[PDB]
Design a protein around this ligand. Structure first.
Ligand SMILES: [Cl-]
Ligand SMILES: [Cl-]
Lengths: 42, 43
């Protein structure tokens, strides 16, 4: 395991927080979902 | 702008590096692309 940095402008971060919160999840959860979803589709 | 951490296992990180290399982009590019694609799909 390692940790990479993600740079987020404040609008995107608010969006991520809003999308995550409405389904009882967190920004970190969402970002991992996004990444895996993306790599799967490949 | 602010910076958030993302925890990645080696398998996922290799996938990311390989996928991005195929299209002449970087891991950072790919991750932002994944995030935005995901946000757009939720709706
Ligand atoms: Cl879950
Ligand atoms: Cl591009």
């Amino acid at each position: 395991t390692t940790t990479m940095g993600v740079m987020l402008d404040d609008a995107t971060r608010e969006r991520i927080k809003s999308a995550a919160t409405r389904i009882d999840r967190t920004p970190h959860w969402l970002i991992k979902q996004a990444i895996f979803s993306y790599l799967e589709q490949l």
